[PDB]
């Protein structure tokens, strides 16, 4: 009956139709929650290969022809792999090894972007920053960032209060250990009535050996104290024990008295 046939125009694929998920590890890894990452058409036999590579994401069939997208649902990064660095946002797991770069057959695992803006790393770094695993850079930056914690949410503060109590108990035993000296210094730079209160509390709890060794500017001898009464200026302005003292182990009173020494414009000592 001679039908009037007509062929459709030749197809012109879009950028989405040319997407190859096997080339998109640097596109999918920085994705955040609630964000769809289109990965182009995906054969049915390759869905398990994609879902195992990105267990944190949900594979969603968005359109015809197998058009798919990945939607981040979780962050599975662990504390030892996310907390001891401020630059690594993700890593790849393959054959029991952890790598920074992608490799075929590896499994993506990502860190929370706010892992160092909250207290999600306080427990791991409280232990890791003690003893032989102490990294001075990472641990000082961890304690310092706690004082300016972006999570002003009342739970971000409560984690801050919990860390200060743990550091207070720890540093009362020995304030010479490097993470405690870092804590004392950041309390000094915070310059509040609470932080100064905690400084004096920690320093007064130290042993007689600690005070004999580090705090002789705070606890002068009998003859040193009697001698200082003959001078109008505070003792801390001329006492060699105060010019040789570790500023992190000074009582708040001695630290304030050091800034009252009347410098003659230039070098006044």
């Amino acid at each position, epitope marked *: 009956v001679e039908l009037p046939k007509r062929d459709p125009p030749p197809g012109v694929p879009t950028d989405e139709m040319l997407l190859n998920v096997d080339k998109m590890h640097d596109v999918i890894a920085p994705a955040k929650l609630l964000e769809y990452v289109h990965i182009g058409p995906l054969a049915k036999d390759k869905e398990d290969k994609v879902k195992k590579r990105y267990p944190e994401f949900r594979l969603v069939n968005t359109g015809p022809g197998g058009l798919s997208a990945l939607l981040r649902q979780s962050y599975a990064g662990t504390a030892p792999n996310c907390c001891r660095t401020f630059q690594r946002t993700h890593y790849w797991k393959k054959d029991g090894k952890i790598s920074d770069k992608y490799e075929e057959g590896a499994v993506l695992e990502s860190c929370w972007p706010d892992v160092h803006d909250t207290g999600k790393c306080d427990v791991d770094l409280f232990d890791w920053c003690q003893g032989d695993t102490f990294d001075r850079n990472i641990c000082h930056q961890w304690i310092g960032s706690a004082f300016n914690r972006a999570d002003r949410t009342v739970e971000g503060q409560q984690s801050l209060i919990n860390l200060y109590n743990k550091m207070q108990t720890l540093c009362s035993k020995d304030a010479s250990v490097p993470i405690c000296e870092s804590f004392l210094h950041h309390l000094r730079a915070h310059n509040t009535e609470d932080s100064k209160e905690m400084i004096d509390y920690i320093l007064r709890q130290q042993s007689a050996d600690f005070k004999q060794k580090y705090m002789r500017c705070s606890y002068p001898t009998r003859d040193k104290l009697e001698e200082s009464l003959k001078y109008a200026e505070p003792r801390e302005c001329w006492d060699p024990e105060c010019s040789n003292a570790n500023v992190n182990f000074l009582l708040t009173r001695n630290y*304030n008295n050091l800034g009252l020494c009347n410098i003659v414009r230039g070098s006044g000592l």
Partner: nanobody, 119 residues
Framework: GEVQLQASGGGLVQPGGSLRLSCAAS????????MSWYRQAPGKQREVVAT???????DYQDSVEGRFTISRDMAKNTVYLQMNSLKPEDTAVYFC????????????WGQGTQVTVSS
């Protein structure tokens, strides 16, 4: 004559109590003298316990640091010694002391008050 540094506020308290010593100075101005609180146990030499400069910077003996606090009122020209957590070894006669800033001979010693701690 007439440089008065009378110390008061003493008493007998149990260990752990509290006392606020007082010393209202006359003939001497605090904004020009260093005030020091001394004590002398029976049959012992006197020792400085606290001190405050003419600028207000304080300093203490180690055995009383954190427990005692020396303050001053410029209007009232009176220097205080807040004594907290009194230990039995605090038992002594506490008295005032005034020393001129750059005049070494202008030192004066006050009349003491009794502080006893026991049960």
């Amino acid at each position: 004559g007439e440089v008065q540094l009378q110390a008061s506020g003493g008493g007998l308290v149990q260990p752990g109590g509290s006392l606020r010593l007082s010393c209202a100075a006359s003939g001497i101005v605090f904004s020009n003298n260093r005030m020091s609180w001394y004590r002398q146990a029976p049959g012992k030499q006197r020792e400085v316990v606290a001190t405050i400069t003419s600028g207000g910077a304080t300093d203490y003996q180690d055995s009383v640091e954190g427990r005692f606090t020396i303050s001053r009122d410029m209007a009232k020209n009176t220097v205080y010694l807040q004594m907290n957590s009194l230990k039995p070894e605090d038992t002594a006669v506490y008295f005032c002391n005034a020393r001129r800033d750059n005049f070494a001979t202008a030192i004066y010693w006050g009349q003491g008050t009794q502080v006893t701690v026991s049960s």
